[PDB]
Design an enzyme around this catalytic site. Structure first.
Site, PDB file in Angstrom:
ATOM      1  N   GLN A 141       0.768  -1.237   0.000  1.00 44.56           N
ATOM      2  CA  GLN A 141       0.000   0.000   0.000  1.00 44.56           C
ATOM      3  C   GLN A 141       0.807   1.300   0.000  1.00 44.56           C
ATOM      4  O   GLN A 141       0.248   2.372  -0.208  1.00 44.56           O
ATOM      5  CB  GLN A 141      -0.986  -0.013   1.172  1.00 44.56           C
ATOM      6  CG  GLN A 141      -0.231  -0.108   2.484  1.00 44.56           C
ATOM      7  CD  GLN A 141      -1.240  -0.093   3.621  1.00 44.56           C
ATOM      8  OE1 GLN A 141      -1.714  -1.139   4.071  1.00 44.56           O
ATOM      9  NE2 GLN A 141      -1.587   1.104   4.078  1.00 44.56           N
TER      10      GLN A 141
ATOM     11  N   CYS B 288      -5.024   0.585   4.296  1.00 44.20           N
ATOM     12  CA  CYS B 288      -5.121  -0.825   4.661  1.00 44.20           C
ATOM     13  C   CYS B 288      -6.562  -1.323   4.557  1.00 44.20           C
ATOM     14  O   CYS B 288      -6.805  -2.442   4.111  1.00 44.20           O
ATOM     15  CB  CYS B 288      -4.551  -1.073   6.078  1.00 44.20           C
ATOM     16  SG  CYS B 288      -5.407  -0.065   7.365  1.00 44.20           S
TER      17      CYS B 288
ATOM     18  N   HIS C 182      -5.695  -1.432  12.444  1.00 38.94           N
ATOM     19  CA  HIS C 182      -5.205  -1.948  11.164  1.00 38.94           C
ATOM     20  C   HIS C 182      -6.203  -2.945  10.571  1.00 38.94           C
ATOM     21  O   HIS C 182      -6.772  -3.764  11.294  1.00 38.94           O
ATOM     22  CB  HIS C 182      -3.835  -2.614  11.393  1.00 38.94           C
ATOM     23  CG  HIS C 182      -3.138  -2.969  10.113  1.00 38.94           C
ATOM     24  ND1 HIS C 182      -2.886  -2.054   9.114  1.00 38.94           N
ATOM     25  CD2 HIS C 182      -2.595  -4.138   9.694  1.00 38.94           C
ATOM     26  CE1 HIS C 182      -2.220  -2.640   8.135  1.00 38.94           C
ATOM     27  NE2 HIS C 182      -2.030  -3.905   8.462  1.00 38.94           N
TER      28      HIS C 182
ATOM     29  N   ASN D 102      -1.573  -9.447   4.821  1.00 39.12           N
ATOM     30  CA  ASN D 102      -1.354  -8.027   5.089  1.00 39.12           C
ATOM     31  C   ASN D 102      -1.179  -7.332   3.737  1.00 39.12           C
ATOM     32  O   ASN D 102      -1.218  -7.985   2.693  1.00 39.12           O
ATOM     33  CB  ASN D 102      -0.098  -7.853   5.947  1.00 39.12           C
ATOM     34  CG  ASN D 102      -0.123  -6.536   6.707  1.00 39.12           C
ATOM     35  OD1 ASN D 102      -0.989  -5.689   6.492  1.00 39.12           O
ATOM     36  ND2 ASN D 102       0.846  -6.359   7.599  1.00 39.12           N
TER      37      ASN D 102
END
Ligand SMILES: *[C@](=O)([C]([C][C][C][C])[N]C(=O)O[C]C1([C]C2=[C][C]=C(F)[C]=[C]2)[C][C][C]1)C(=O)[N]C1=[C][C]=N[N]1
Ligand SMILES: *[C@](=O)([C]([C][C][C][C])[N]C(=O)O[C]C1([C]C2=[C][C]=C(F)[C]=[C]2)[C][C][C]1)C(=O)[N]C1=[C][C]=N[N]1
Lengths: 215, 215
Positions: free
Chosen positions: A19, A25, A162, A182
């Site tokens: 990202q 996120c 997150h 992630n």
């Protein structure tokens, strides 16, 4: 529900993205969940546009963070979301450049997993597919994670900050875990993934704000 | 001077923010104090840029932490700080991108509260407005705070590891407190706030590293 599940093996998960210097996120988490349902309904796996979400979900804060449910809602009310190829990720908020021509997926709404219920989260992942989850990823231990089943007593489930994607669950070395995708690049963690402790008192708040889109 | 003060009621406090994973609590604390003085001097309440501080206060350590006083010093020397809109927060250190045209506030100096003096801190909050403060927020009891006046004998007054904002003070059920604004999102604590013990032997080091900017 099976003792273990890994949607990566089933081709429901696109490659790990990076990202950059943008607090998006939540957009990657959202597209990840959408990509899972798209593959499950159409049989095709393709990258959806996180930029589309960053730029067009007015209720969220673009590169400053946002809710995955607002993203799902946006796709639903917008009648679609563009593919990554049609609306490329650039790393900063831009004016909304969505166009139906690049539409690659739709959304009929979403559901939220009962707060703090990992067993519920397990059921959802098993039946639905990848699920968007929120956690406390503020610890340096999380930032430098390399391998193994992650558990840090200092994690704060009361501080969700997150957004990631639960693409499965299982056990390793006798420790139950969640397979988490992630968006910090393939060079982060274990090829971009982290195994987070499961059934360990809702560690990091993994089951406090989870959701998935209806397709 | 007054027995109780709550700047939230006076419109000197912006909404609670979520700092993500970046160690920018000091930046949020700093802008919180600046926002209070800006409201006082111009009558307008607006989000100022913590990202501006994270990226441009070379005297600090970016996402690794920093002093609120160094932040105020920077705003003074720099001749201003940007609004959040002109320099949005992304939760990661970027190159300094200070936009002079996006300047939304100035700083003509700052003062540090006499170390350990809660009486002085009280007078400062009453007269000046919100004040930046540092505390020991390492305890699990602090992390999972929900209500009441927070007090834990295990807190260490000389372990100043977290920067927050004192937006007032008062008393609840006979327990004197400080009204503290955190930067862990609106879902942390009590709507993003926590009442911390006041006059309880400088609990958590509340008056050991406090300061406020002047406009
Ligand atoms: C990421 O963790 C984002 C960054 C937010 C701060 C820049 N967090 C996030 O979006 O979390 C979403 C929530 C909490 C929230 C809601 C609304 C907001 F406006 C802000 C935060 C958790 C459930 C909802 C992120 O992008 N991290 C990152 C920044 C730079 N590189 N990686
Ligand atoms: C926060 O508590 C920061 C994190 C710093 C470590 C990553 N602490 C902080 O800035 O405190 C500021 C001080 C102590 C200090 C001075 C200088 C430094 F370089 C480091 C620390 C207290 C008064 C000065 C913070 O952002 N926490 C947080 C990170 C992610 N979510 N919350």
């Amino acid at each position: 529900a099976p003792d273990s599940v890994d949607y990566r093996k089933k081709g429901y998960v696109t490659p790990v993205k990076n990202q950059g210097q943008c607090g998006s996120c939540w957009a990657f988490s959202s597209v990840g969940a959408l990509e899972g349902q798209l593959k499950k309904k159409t049989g095709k796996l393709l990258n959806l546009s996180p930029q589309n979400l960053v730029d067009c979900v007015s209720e969220n804060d673009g590169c400053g963070g946002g809710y995955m449910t607002n993203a799902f809602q946006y796709v639903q009310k917008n009648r679609g979301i563009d593919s990554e190829d049609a609306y490329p990720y650039v790393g900063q908020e831009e004016s909304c450049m969505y166009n139906p021509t690049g539409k690659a997926a739709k959304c009929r709404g979403y559901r939220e997993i009962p707060e703090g219920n990992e067993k519920a989260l397990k059921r959802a992942v098993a039946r639905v597919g990848p699920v968007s989850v929120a956690i406390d990823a503020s610890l340096t231990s999380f930032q430098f994670y390399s391998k193994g089943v992650y558990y840090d007593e200092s994690c704060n489930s009361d501080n969700l900050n997150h957004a990631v994607l639960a693409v499965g669950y299982g056990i390793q070395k006798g420790n139950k875990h969640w397979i988490i995708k992630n968006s910090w690049g393939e060079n982060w963690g274990n090829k971009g993934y982290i195994l987070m402790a499961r059934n360990k008192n809702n560690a990091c708040g993994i089951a406090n704000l989870a959701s998935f889109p209806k397709m």
